[PDB]
Write a protein that binds this ligand. Structure first.
Ligand SMILES: O=c1ccn([C@@H]2O[C@H](COP(=O)(O)OP(=O)(O)O)[C@@H](O)[C@H]2O)c(=O)[nH]1
Ligand SMILES: O=c1ccn([C@@H]2O[C@H](COP(=O)(O)OP(=O)(O)O)[C@@H](O)[C@H]2O)c(=O)[nH]1
Ligand SMILES: Nc1ccn([C@H]2C[C@H](O)[C@@H](COP(=O)(O)O)O2)c(=O)n1
Ligand SMILES: Nc1ccn([C@H]2C[C@H](O)[C@@H](COP(=O)(O)O)O2)c(=O)n1
Ligand SMILES: [Mg+2]
Ligand SMILES: [Mg+2]
Lengths: 228, 228
């Protein structure tokens, strides 16, 4: 019933920041953040699976990438049955979609030789199935790509904090950048969900600050949503 | 609409063997085998995740145990919508249930220090969730425990073949045996599904051959089912 918009971007590009600005511009506009919280502390002071992947990827890239996508579905599906469900002109913004999970990060980790054939086969198999049961209602109506040079992102990773991502090199962000570009800009990166084929994509340059110029961006978004 | 019966046993105890005897005793009696096929070949030529777990458990016990339970649900759920669905007095026999997956094998692998805290937490968390969505229709109506000394099993593991299980020692089978005993016989092994509490359990000694004495056993089963 609700219009579902996904906010794609690189690491520390600024989805959270950008969405919070939209969040407070309507009571019929909710958000569904990546559960990065539970990734740094597993539960049911446990363990930090995010950090484990970073410290030794060739070992935890699979474990993580799986838990990560599961955790996201659980979260998106929930906010889907929330109070918002009964409003008039509702819109739900997702911080990333299960698509970038698999086609951007997971994929890139496999190409970076952190997941062997067997692991990467299982992952796709698992993912393919999961998004055929529940995923039937998480289909997107639109996508907003916050474009930003990997250098700008590497900077915002520092400005942010998280003592896990501090070891991340430009190379990694760069590889992840091209992945985004290929998928949302040049639209050459092929999926496995033939519907993304006809899905609208607003791209915004977010290399310059937000808390200031954020006026212009919003205008373009209101515009975009008005055509769905 | 179908009565679901689970056939629990140790490794190579003889479920497959025993069920095939029942399978051919009614057209309203189908079977759902462990997809051990796809576990030895993930591509469907590819990698053998079963063997990987055996060669280096402290590394693949998690990956395997997860795929294994997923694969089972996918299979049980399917046969659940098969032609059998519209018969008169239908019965579907499961080779193992997701319960022994988690409380017998996975559990025991964690206690054997092959899954660290973080892995075992995620597994339970994952499993707890999975069996709350679909699992709602895979609830058992009865269970049949094929009891057999671990030694007898170790023997049948040899008689069978599988060049993966040939490295298995008695200790392993023994540990797995007590697990079974504690859960289905002494019923002291506590779960997390408060309904198994009131579920019927027929135990049969299968230490002596089947292709012969298999008459007696069947009698006791027809008997058991008649009271459900
Ligand atoms: O114009 C901007 C936009 C964002 N940020 C920084 O971006 C960080 C947040 O990055 P974010 O968490 O939003 O990346 P995301 O989680 O949205 O993907 C904040 O600490 C801000 O300091 C900034 O400095 N200037
Ligand atoms: O009375 C019997 C029943 C079974 N088997 C052996 O049990 C093996 C099969 O073990 P099974 O695969 O049935 O264990 P399961 O897969 O049912 O758990 C076969 O090769 C048989 O040779 C046997 O020797 N005598
Ligand atoms: N599918 C995903 C999602 C997140 N992350 C990790 C990578 C970064 O360390 C952090 C990024 O969080 P965010 O995307 O909000 O910047 O989480 C990941 O590896 N794979
Ligand atoms: N939950 C499960 C099911 C099977 N197996 C593995 C262990 C044995 O090598 C083989 C046993 O198959 P079966 O139980 O049909 O004898 O598969 C396992 O480790 N855990
Ligand atoms: Mg965030
Ligand atoms: Mg078998």
């Amino acid at each position: 019933r609700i219009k579902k918009i996904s906010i794609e971007g690189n690491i520390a590009a600024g989805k959270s920041t950008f969405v919070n600005i939209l969040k407070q511009l309507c009571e019929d506009w909710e958000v569904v953040p990546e559960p990065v919280a539970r990734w740094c502390n597993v539960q049911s002071n446990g363990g930090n699976v995010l950090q484990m992947m970073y410290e030794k990827p060739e070992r935890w890239s699979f474990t993580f990438q799986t838990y990560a996508c599961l955790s996201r579905i659980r979260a998106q599906l929930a906010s889907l049955n929330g109070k918002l469900k009964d409003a008039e002109k509702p819109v739900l913004f997702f911080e990333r979609s299960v698509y970038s999970d698999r086609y951007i990060f997971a994929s890139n980790l496999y190409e970076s030789e952190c997941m062997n054939e067997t692991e990467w086969t299982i992952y796709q198999d698992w993912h393919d199935w999961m998004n055929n049961q529940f995923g039937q209602s998480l289909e997107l109506d639109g996508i907003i790509y916050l474009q930003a040079t990997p250098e700008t992102c590497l900077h915002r990773i520092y400005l942010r904090g998280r003592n896990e991502e501090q070891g991340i090199p430009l190379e990694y962000l760069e590889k992840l950048h091209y992945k985004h570009e290929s998928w949302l800009l040049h639209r050459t990166l092929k999926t496995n969900f033939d519907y993304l084929q006809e899905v609208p994509i607003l791209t915004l340059d977010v290399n310059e600050d937000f808390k200031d110029k954020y006026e212009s961006l919003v205008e373009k978004v209101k515009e975009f949503l008005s055509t769905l």
